[PDB]
Amino acid sequence: NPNHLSYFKFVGRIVAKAVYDNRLLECYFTRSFYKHILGKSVRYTDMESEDYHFYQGLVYLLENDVSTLGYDLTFSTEVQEFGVCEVRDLKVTEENKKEYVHLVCQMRMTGAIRKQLAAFLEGFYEIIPKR
């Protein structure tokens, strides 16, 4: 839909309108999306439901030595957004991976939805103050 961002801004407005009216919607958004509307980072355990084999990959990165991979990785990943696939930088080491799993989960959740998200957040904060 070429206007989809506008409809996501509409639904953010309608959610904030439901909150203003104090009326319950049958929305059941992910903890990731509720965190985005609250401005909280997601956590890697959220990936288990969204992309189990990518969660499993991050869990194989956690509590395992990088030497188990047998080839190197860096802070860059291939992401499909809007049907275009692009390799994007995220900013590997024993110190960096703690951030990689946080940041890689940020990229995987928001990258493909960042423009829908910015429209929804504009609709929400238009009616319900972020703070």
From Swiss-Prot:
PTM text: Phosphorylated on tyrosine; phosphorylation is probably required for its ability to inhibit TP53 transactivation.
Domain of life: Eukaryota
Compartments, as annotated in UniProt: Cytoplasm; Nucleus; Mitochondrion
Tissue: Weakly expressed in heart, brain and placenta but not in other tissues. Expressed in a number of cell lines, predominantly in those from colorectal carcinomas.
Free-text function comment from the UniProt entry: E3 ubiquitin-protein ligase which mediates ubiquitination and subsequent proteasomal degradation of target proteins. Regulates apoptosis by catalyzing the polyubiquitination and degradation of MCL1. Mediates monoubiquitination of DNA polymerase beta (POLB) at 'Lys-41', 'Lys-61' and 'Lys-81', thereby playing a role in base-excision repair. Also ubiquitinates the p53/TP53 tumor suppressor and core histones including H1, H2A, H2B, H3 and H4. Ubiquitinates MFN2 to negatively regulate mitochondrial fusion in response to decreased stearoylation of TFRC.
Subunit structure: Interacts with isoform p14ARF of CDKN2A which strongly inhibits HUWE1 ubiquitin ligase activity. Interacts with MYCN, POLB and CDC6. Interacts with isoform 2 of PA2G4. Interacts with NR1D1. Interacts with AMBRA1. Interacts with HAPSTR1. Interacts with HAPSTR2. In hepatocytes, interacts with PAQR3; the interaction promotes PPARA poylubiquitination and STUB1-mediated degradation.
Illness: Intellectual developmental disorder, X-linked, syndromic, Turner type: An X-linked neurodevelopmental disorder with highly variable clinical manifestations. Common features consist of moderate to profound intellectual disability, delayed or absent speech, short stature with small hands and feet, and non-specific but recurrent dysmorphic facial features such as macrocephaly, microcephaly, a broad nasal tip, deep set eyes, epicanthic folds, short palpebral fissures and a short philtrum. Patients may manifest other features, such as hypotonia, seizures and delayed bone age.
Domain notes: The HECT domain mediates inhibition of the transcriptional activity of p53.
Family the entry assigns: Belongs to the UPL family. TOM1/PTR1 subfamily.
Name of the featured protein: E3 ubiquitin-protein ligase HUWE1
Species: Homo sapiens (Human)
Gene expressing this chain: HUWE1
